Design a binder for this molecule. Structure first.
Ligand SMILES: *[C@@H]1O[C@H](CO)[C@@H](O)[C@H](O)[C@H]1NC(C)=O
Lengths: 49, 48
């Protein structure tokens, strides 16, 4: 439950360069592909189990 | 000359590439139709 976004999946350290003004990432069909932690601001990749 | 005819013309196998393109397009549109709200408040059952 990331700042309100609720879902399921495996969290992995991201390797894509989020710009400092971005907070979320999306694949095709509005699928949330990545998210940054609201606490440590690290980018995380979301993959369905 | 058969090989030259197949090499010079890139669109020679279009009748065979068309089915693959159609299948890919069908799958792509079926995947993209998930973002449709269909009149609902949102397109994500999690948020709903
Ligand atoms: C929030 O608090 C945790 C633990 O107190 C800390 O590790 C983290 O850096 C804090 N984040 C911010 C943005 O202050």
């Amino acid at each position: 439950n990331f700042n309100g976004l609720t879902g399921t999946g495996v969290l992995t350290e991201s390797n894509k360069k989020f710009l400092p003004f971005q907070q979320f990432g999306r694949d095709i069909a509005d699928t949330t592909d990545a998210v940054r932690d609201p606490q440590t601001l690290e980018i995380l990749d979301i993959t369905p189990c | 000359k058969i090989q030259d005819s197949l090499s010079s013309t890139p669109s020679a196998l279009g009748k065979l590439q068309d089915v693959v393109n159609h299948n890919a397009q069908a799958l792509n549109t079926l995947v993209k139709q998930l973002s449709s709200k269909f009149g609902a408040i949102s397109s994500v059952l999690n948020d709903i």
